[PDB]
Each structure stands twice: as structure tokens, then as C-alpha cells.
Amino acid sequence: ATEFTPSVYSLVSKPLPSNSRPSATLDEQAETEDLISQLFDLTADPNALVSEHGKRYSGLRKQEHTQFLASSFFQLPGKFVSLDASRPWLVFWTVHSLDLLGVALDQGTKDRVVSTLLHFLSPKGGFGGGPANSQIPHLLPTYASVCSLAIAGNDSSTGGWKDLAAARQSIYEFFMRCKRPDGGFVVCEGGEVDVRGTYCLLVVATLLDIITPELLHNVDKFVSACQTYEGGFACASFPFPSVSEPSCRVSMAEAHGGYTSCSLNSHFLLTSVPLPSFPLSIDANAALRWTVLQQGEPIEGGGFRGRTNKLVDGCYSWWVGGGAPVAEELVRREKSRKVIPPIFNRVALQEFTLVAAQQDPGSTGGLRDKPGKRPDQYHTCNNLSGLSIAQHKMSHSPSTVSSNRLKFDASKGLPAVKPVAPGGGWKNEDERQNARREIWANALGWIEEEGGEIIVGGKDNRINTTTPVFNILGLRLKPFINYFYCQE
Amino acid sequence: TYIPMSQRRSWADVKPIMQDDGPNPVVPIMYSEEYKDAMDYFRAIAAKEEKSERALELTEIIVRMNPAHYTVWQYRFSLLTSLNKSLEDELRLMNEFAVQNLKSYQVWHHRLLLLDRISPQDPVSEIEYIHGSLLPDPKNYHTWAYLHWLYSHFSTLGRISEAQWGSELDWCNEMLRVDGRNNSAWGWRWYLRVSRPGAETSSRSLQDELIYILKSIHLIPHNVSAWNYLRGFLKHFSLPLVPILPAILPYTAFGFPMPSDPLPEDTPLPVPLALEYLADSFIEQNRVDDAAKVFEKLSSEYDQMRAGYWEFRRRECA
Numbered sequence: 001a002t003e004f005t006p007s008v009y010s011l012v013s014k015p016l017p018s019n020s021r022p023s024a025t026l027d028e029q030a031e032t033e034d035l036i037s038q039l040f041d042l043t044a045d046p047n048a049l050v051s052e053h054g055k056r057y058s059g060l061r062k063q064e065h066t067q068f069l070a071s072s073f074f075q076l077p078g079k080f081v082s083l084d085a086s087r088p089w090l091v092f093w094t095v096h097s098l099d100l101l102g103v104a105l106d107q108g109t110k111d112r113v114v115s116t117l118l119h120f121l122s123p124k125g126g127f128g129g130g131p132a133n134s135q136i137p138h139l140l141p142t143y144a145s146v147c148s149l150a151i152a153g154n155d156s157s158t159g160g161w162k163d164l165a166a167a168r169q170s171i172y173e174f175f176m177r178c179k180r181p182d183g184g185f186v187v188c189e190g191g192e193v194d195v196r197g198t199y200c201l202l203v204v205a206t207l208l209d210i211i212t213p214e215l216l217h218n219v220d221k222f223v224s225a226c227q228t229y230e231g232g233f234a235c236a237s238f239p240f241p242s243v244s245e246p247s248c249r250v251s252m253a254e255a256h257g258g259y260t261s262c263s264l265n266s267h268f269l270l271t272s273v274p275l276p277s278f279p280l281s282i283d284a285n286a287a288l289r290w291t292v293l294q295q296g297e298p299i300e301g302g303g304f305r306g307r308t309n310k311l312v313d314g315c316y317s318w319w320v321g322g323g324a325p326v327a328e329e330l331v332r333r334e335k336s337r338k339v340i341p342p343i344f345n346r347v348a349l350q351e352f353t354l355v356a357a358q359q360d361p362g363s364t365g366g367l368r369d370k371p372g373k374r375p376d377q378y379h380t381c382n383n384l385s386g387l388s389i390a391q392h393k394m395s396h397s398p399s400t401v402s403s404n405r406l407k408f409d410a411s412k413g414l415p416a417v418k419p420v421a422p423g424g425g426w427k428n429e430d431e432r433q434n435a436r437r438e439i440w441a442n443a444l445g446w447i448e449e450e451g452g453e454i455i456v457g458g459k460d461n462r463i464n465t466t467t468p469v470f471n472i473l474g475l476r477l478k479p480f481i482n483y484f485y486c487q488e
Numbered sequence: 489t490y491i492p493m494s495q496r497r498s499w500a501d502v503k504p505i506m507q508d509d510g511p512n513p514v515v516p517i518m519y520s521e522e523y524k525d526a527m528d529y530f531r532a533i534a535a536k537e538e539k540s541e542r543a544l545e546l547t548e549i550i551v552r553m554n555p556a557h558y559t560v561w562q563y564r565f566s567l568l569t570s571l572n573k574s575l576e577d578e579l580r581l582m583n584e585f586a587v588q589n590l591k592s593y594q595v596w597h598h599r600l601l602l603l604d605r606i607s608p609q610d611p612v613s614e615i616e617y618i619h620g621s622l623l624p625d626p627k628n629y630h631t632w633a634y635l636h637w638l639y640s641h642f643s644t645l646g647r648i649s650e651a652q653w654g655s656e657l658d659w660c661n662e663m664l665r666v667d668g669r670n671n672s673a674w675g676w677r678w679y680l681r682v683s684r685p686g687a688e689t690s691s692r693s694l695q696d697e698l699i700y701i702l703k704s705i706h707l708i709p710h711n712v713s714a715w716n717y718l719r720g721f722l723k724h725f726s727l728p729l730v731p732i733l734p735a736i737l738p739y740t741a742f743g744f745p746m747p748s749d750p751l752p753e754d755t756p757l758p759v760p761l762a763l764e765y766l767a768d769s770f771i772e773q774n775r776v777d778d779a780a781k782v783f784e785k786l787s788s789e790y791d792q793m794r795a796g797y798w799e800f801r802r803r804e805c806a
């Protein structure tokens with residue numbers, strides 16, 4: 001299983017060559033190479049049957065990481081005020097990390113999570129970064145709150161899912177207020193336009209059964225035009241007018257792992273939607289190429305960088321590593337449409353996580369960007385989400401999607417959303433029910449391939465399996481989306 | 489020493505409103521007295537929808553303590569437009585925020601909204617400010633995206649002259665001269681030379697561009713930014729790979745730039761992306777076995793971190 005995933009310890013470590021041309025980029029790259037390679041030299045190779053005497057043991061320190069996250073349920077120091085508008089992200093990073101680590105919350109604590117998040121929900125639609133009497137709704141807290149409710153909530157009267165269902169029309173109306181004619185969305189009233197908003201909106205609309213044609217118009221075009229000449233995706237594309245129908249669209253910055261994740265995931269969610277000539281295609285081969293080129297060399301521990309000629313960073317294990325199965329599936333569909341070894345080094349990425357991204361032992365716990373950086377909730381969640389993708393071979397299974405179609409019950413569902421414009425809905429019930437079936441059946445199409453597991457360092461390092469595109473456990477995704485589609 | 493707002497005569501008519509996240513919320517933050525007090529009065533101000541100078545002052549106090557507070561930034565911009573405040577004064581305040589390391593998506597968006605609403609007939613002074621602002625971080629992603637937006641928005645209005653585009657390329661060339669590994673500046677060159685709607689596409693410009701690309705590779709043979717730009721360039725314009733192979737082959741061991749006769753020091757061979765070029769040029773020649781042999785070497789010898797990807801490319805040749 002590992003013939004094409006060589007361990008970092010089995011490869012020759014060499015610095016990035018200078019070509020006798022110093023620059024500020026190379027100064028920082030070389031210092032980071034020294035930092036990471038020195039920590040690997042002090043750490044026992046995780047692939048050894050007996051851990052070496054004198055060296056650091058790289059085992060995943062799950063209890064330290066659990067205690068690091070525990071402050072979330074008591075209080076955070078005053079320096080966290082910089083995240084006061086991102087409190088749903090603090091919830092998500094905590095409760096998804098605990099899911100991955102296999103640690104259960106008791107029901108009282110889950111109820112506190114649910115109740116706190118429902119205080120962030122506005123009657124007019126959407127979640128904000130804090131209490132609805134203090135903050136206006138925002139697409140990014142709306143994703144974080146919805147996913148957190150999938151992780152901590154339930155279908156009872158105190159479980160929060162009943163409240164989300166009653167909010168479906170208002171959330172939809174918030175989404176349509178955010179919509180621009182060119183296919184972008186503002187993240188909030190008067191806010192910025194980029195593919196983070198598109199991703200967060202499409203995840204939530206998929207999960208809650210509130211997708212319509214008027215919501216999706218031009219969204220595929222906005223995303224496709226974010227792809228750069230490097231093959232990844234930028235934050236946004238600019239619509240140049242002719243003198244909703246621009247003459248052309250142009251990407252506005254570099255390909256970046258965070259926006260490439262959001263763009264690939266958005267495009268993948270749109271491929272489930274049965275609209276004519278939709279979604280506009282992307283260059284999947286180039287996106288797969290860009291993805292694998294961002295995995296660092298052995299001297300930098302095999303972690304991912306977020307963009308060309310910048311530094312490796314543990315959080316890109318999720319953003320770039322977690323985009324790899326999506327890009328793979330799109331490439332496979334292109335190959336099929338015209339008519340297997342792992343696509344990135346699944347072993348080296350685990351080694352980066354265990355050796356370089358964990359806080360030093362006997363300390364606060366948590367996971368981090370790089371050695372020398374304090375751990376935080378965000379790098380804890382994204383290091384572990386990427387580790388999960390590396391440990392478990394994920395693929396989107398056509399036979400599983402077909403089996404989902406066979407069991408879908410289109411006579412069950414919540415009330416159809418009322419479109420803002422008269423002709424903005426599906427044409428008739430036949431087309432709306434076909435859309436619901438495809439979107440539900442494909443959302444539940446990701447599987448872990450049997451026999452594809454690779455747990456570097458032994459089975460005690462294993463964490464649970466996350467889902468590509470949504471980034472919650474499948475055991476959370478399935479009952480949550482089944483609740484809103486009334487399936488069982 | 490701090491004077492609470494309940495003790496300030498200018499705020500005596502206002503009843504503050506406490507934060508409402510329930511009796512025992514998760515992820516609570518231990519707020520300073522100053523920050524809680526300001527947000528208590530902001531909740532009251534926003535509730536009564538007051539647009540006033542004291543509300544404006546209060547939003548500045550808050551975003552100084554938390555520059556990522558998007559709700560307060562939103563309220564601040566509506567205050568500026570309702571009161572018909574000087575947007576040029578606000579721009580000077582934003583220049584100070586950058587100096588004092590107060591930064592976020594929200595501050596950058598605020599600046600964009602100001603430029604959009606001012607709508608200068610010539611945005612040259614803002615362009616120059618953005619250039620200078622890249623000094624502490626020449627790869628700041630928000631700054632590069634904002635520069636793209638600024639040229640795109642004001643070119644749609646017809647307000648970017650040919651002289652302005654010319655000096656922008658001059659500035660870009662100097663950025664890449666100081667650090668040829670700045671991938672953000674390579675991205676900007678692509679906008680200036682290829683993707684922007686007004687770019688020239690002629691026989692001369694394609695020749696010029698290929699000369700600049702090849703010279704850049706010969707200066708820094710291991711610079712991934714230059715290789716990606718070369719591959720994007722050829723693909724975008726559907727240009728064959730083979731005619732250029734003479735300039736690439738020395739890295740795999742006509743009139744377009746060639747490598748130095750002794751290569752620069754610290755240039756170990758082969759360059760993996762040079763091998764990728766060779767393999768793809770073999771494929772262009774329908775020599776799939778020669779391409780497969782090159783992919784196999786990338787997989788097992790020269791780029792082993794990507795052993796599986798290069799093996800996947802090898803198998804596709806069959």
C-alpha cells in the first residue's frame with residue numbers, strides 16, 4: 001500500500017537549491033528547512049517496530065490535544081477578542097476535533113453548544129459570529145454553526161435541528177440577499193465577495209434542501225473563472241461588462257490552498273445539480289497537478305504549502321490534502337467521459353502531522369502551523385482533518401450513489417422554499433424531486449475504500465474518517481442530511 | 489484610568505444593552521472592561537439605528553480593539569455615507585490602521601468600498617500607496633487581490649491610461665528583479681500581460697514574453713514560479729513544446745535565450761520540472777514510451793515525494 005508513498009526518513013533530505021541567486025524567499029525557506037529537519041532528526045522514525053532510545057516518540061498525543069480543546073467549554077483569555085466575530089468557528093474547530101479524536105461530549109454539554117449557537121441565529125435569516133443582538137448574519141459563521149449543529153445536535157425538541165428546519169425559508173432569503181448577478185455572493189451585508197462565501201453557502205444549501213435555480217445562476221461561472229494559470233484557484237473572479245452577462249471573467253490573485261479547496265468543493269457540489277449545461281467545467285488535470293506540487297520535500301517533512309514559493313504549514317493538510325480526493329474524482333470523470341497508486345504521499349503527510357505539527361510533549365497540547373508556532377484551535381482542527389484524509393483512502397463511489405438513488409423517497413420532505421422571483425424555482429415537481437434525489441444521493445456518495453487504510457506509527461494513531469467536501473464525520477452527515485430531506 | 493461610559497455626560501441618555509448569548513454559553517471570551525463597555529453601548533446605538541458623530545467615534549474605538557469585527561465595520565460605513573463624511577479623511581485613517589498593524593479582511597474591504605464610492609477620476613495615488621504598502625510583506629494576499637480589483641474596476645470605467653499600464657509593468661519587473669521567487673508578482677505579470685482584457689496579443693508580444701520567461705528560468709533554474717508560468721503560457725496560447733526544447737534539455741541531464749555555458753553554481757541536475765517538460769513534449773510527439781520512461785524516473789529517482797502521481801502519469805501513457 002506504501003510502495004509509492006515513501007517515508008521522509010527513507011529519502012535523502014537536501015535544501016532547495018539556490019542557483020547562486022539569494023533572495024528573501026530563499027532566506028525564509030532555508031530557515032524553515034533547518035527548523036523542520038532538526039525536529040525530525042530528534043524524533044524516532046514512526047515506522048519502526050521498537051521506538052529508538054534517546055529520541056522523541058512521535059505517537060499522536062490525543063489526551064494532550066483533548067485537554068487543549070477543553071478550555072472551549074470553560075472560557076478563553078482576553079486575547080481571543082480578535083476571534084469575537086468568529087465564535088461559531090471556535091465551536092466547530094473544537095467539536096469536530098473531538099469527533100476526530102474519538103471523544104464524546106455528554107448531553108448537557110451538547111445542549112449548551114446547541115443553545116449557544118441558536119442565540120447566534122437571526123429571525124431574518126442566517127447565523128452571525130456571535131449573538132444575534134450583537135452581530136449581523138454572515139455566510140462563514142452560518143457554515144460553522146450548521147456543521148456544529150450536525151455534530152452536537154439531534155432531532156428532539158432541544159436538539160436544534162427542529163429550529164434549523166423552521167429557519168429554512170429565512171436562511172434561503174438571506175442567501176438570495178447575498179447573491180450578485182455575476183454569480184458571486186457577498187459574505188454579509190456590505191461584505192467581501194469570494195469563493196469562501198460560495199463554498200459555505202453551497203454546503204448549507206445542500207444540507208438543508210434549499211437549492212433553487214435562481215440561487216445557482218452564474219455560480220458555476222464565477223467559480224470556474226477563479227482558476228489560475230498554475231491550476232489552483234484564486235479568491236475571486238472579476239466580471240468585465242459587455243461594453244449578469246459579462247464579456248469575460250478574470251481571476252484576481254494567486255492560486256491558494258484555501259481558495260482551491262473552496263473552489264473544488266463548490267464545483268463538486270454543483271455537479272450534482274441537474275441543470276442544462278451546468279456547471280461550467282474546470283481544468284481538473286491542472287488542479288490535480290497544482291495540488292500535488294504543493295506537497296513539500298523530505299527536508300520540510302512532507303507537509304503542504306498553501307502557494308508556490310511560500311512555506312509548508314500544517315493547516316494545508318486539510319485545505320490542499322483534503323482537496324486531493326475531489327480533484328481525483330473530477331479527473332476520473334473526465335477520463336471516463338473520453339472513453340491505482342495514491343496521488344499524494346499519504347505517509348509523509350502523516351509524518352509531518354506526528355513529528356512537526358504536534359505541540360512538544362508535556363505541554364499545553366494542541367497542533368500548530370510549524371515548529372516555533374503556538375498551537376491553536378484552527379491548526380488543531382485542520383491538522384487532524386488532513387491527517388484523517390491521509391489515513392483513510394476516500395473516494396466518491398458511483399455504485400454507492402446509484403444505491404442511494406434507489407432508496408430515495410421523493411414523497412417525503414420539508415416544505416419547498418418560496419423563490420424570491422416568480423420564475424426562480426424548479427419548473428415542476430418532477431424536476432424538483434429529481435434535483436432533491438441527485439443532490440442528496442451524491443452528498444452521501446463518499447466512502448472509505450476497504451483495505452485502503454494507512455496508519456503511520458501504529459493503530460493507536462488512527463483517528464476517525466472525515467468526509468471530503470463537508471469536513472464532518474460521515475456518521476454525523478448521514479442522519480443530519482436525512483433529517484432535512486425526511487429520509488431514513 | 490478608565491472612565492465608564494455610564495459616567496460620561498455625552499452618553500447619559502443611552503441605556504446600554506447587554507450581550508445575549510444565554511445563561512451559560514460555550515466559547516466565552518474574557519472581555520476587557522473597555523471592550524464590553526463599548527459593545528454594550530454599540531448594541532444600544534445599533535438597536536435605535538442612531539447615525540451620529542458619537543456613534544462614529546464608538547465604532548472606531550471598537551475596531552481598534554477588534555479589527556475583524558465585521559458588524560461594526562458595516563455600521564461604520566453606513567455612518568460615513570449617512571453623515572456625508574469626508575471619505576478622504578477616512579482613507580488617511582485606514583493608512584494609519586495599516587501602520588499600527590490593525591488588519592483583516594474587513595479593513596481591506598472597507599478600503600475597497602471607500603475607493604468605489606469616492607470613484608476618483610485618476611486612482612494613481614492609491615496605486616502608489618498599495619505599492620509602498622507591500623514593503624513589510626511583499627506577498628500579502630489581500631494586498632495583491634486588492635491591486636487586481638483596483639486596476640480591473642477603474643479600467644472598466646476607462647480610467648487607466650496606456651502610460652499607467654506601462655509603469656505598472658515597470659514596477660512588476662522591479663519586484664521580480666528584487667525577488668524572482670515572488671509568486672505573487674508572477675501572478676500580477678500574468679494579469680498585466682495575458683489575462684486583462686486590454687492586453688496585446690501579437691507575434692511580437694508572444695516573442696517578448698517567451699524571452700522574459702526563458703531568461704528568468706536561466707537565472708533561477710529551480711524556481712517553480714517560472715516553470716509554472718512557462719507551462720501556463722504555452723498551454724493558454726496553444727503553443728507547441730518541442731521548438732523550445734533546446735533551452736530546456738540542458739536541465740534534464742534558435743534565437744531564444746539559452747542556459748549559461750557553465751550553469752550557475754548550486755544547480756543540481758536534473759531539474760524535475762524540466763523532466764516534466766520533456767515527458768510532455770514526448771507526448772506531444774506521440775512518443776508515449778519515451779514519455780513513460782521519463783515519468784518512471786521522476787517517480788522512482790528524481791521527484792520521489794510525488795512517486796504516486798508520476799506513476800499515475802506513467803500508466804496513462806499505456
Ligand SMILES: CCCC[C@H]1CN(c2cccc(OC(F)(F)F)c2)C(=O)CN1Cc1cncn1Cc1ccc(F)cc1
Pocket residue numbers: 086089140258313315369376377378379
Ligand atoms: C486561531 C487563529 C487562526 C488564524 C488563521 C485562520 N483565520 C480564520 C479566522 C476565522 C475563521 C476562519 O475560517 C476558516 F478559514 F475556515 F478557518 C479562519 C484567519 O483569519 C488567519 N489565519 C491565519 C493562518 C494560519 N495559517 C494559515 N493562515 C492564513 C489564513 C488566512 C485567512 C483564513 F481565513 C484562513 C487562513
Ligand SMILES: CC(C)=CCC/C(C)=C/CC/C(C)=C/COP(=O)(O)OP(=O)(O)O
Pocket residue numbers: 140196199200256257258259262305306307310311313319627628629630
Ligand atoms: C471555508 C473557509 C473560510 C475557507 C478559507 C480557507 C483558507 C486557508 C483561506 C486562506 C486565505 C488567505 C488570504 C491566506 C493567506 O494568508 P498567509 O499569507 O498568512 O499564509 P500563507 O503564507 O500560507 O499563504
Ligand SMILES: O=S(=O)(O)C[C@H](O)CNC1CCCCC1
Pocket residue numbers: 060061062063064065
Ligand atoms: O501523550 S498523551 O497520550 O496524550 C497523555 C500523556 O502521555 C499522559 N501521560 C500520563 C503519565 C502518567 C501515567 C498516565 C499517562
Ligand SMILES: O=S(=O)(O)C[C@H](O)CNC1CCCCC1
Pocket residue numbers: 122123124125132133134135136531534535559
Ligand atoms: O429581527 S432580526 O433583523 O432578524 C435581528 C435583529 O436585526 C438584530 N440585529 C442586530 C442588532 C444590533 C446590532 C447587530 C445586529
Ligand SMILES: O=S(=O)(O)C[C@H](O)CNC1CCCCC1
Pocket residue numbers: 059457458459460461
Ligand atoms: O495495533 S498495532 O499497530 O499493531 C500497535 C499499537 O497500536 C502500538 N501502540 C503503542 C503501544 C504502546 C504505547 C504507545 C502506543
Ligand SMILES: [Zn+2]
Pocket residue numbers: 313314315316369379
Ligand atoms: Zn496555518
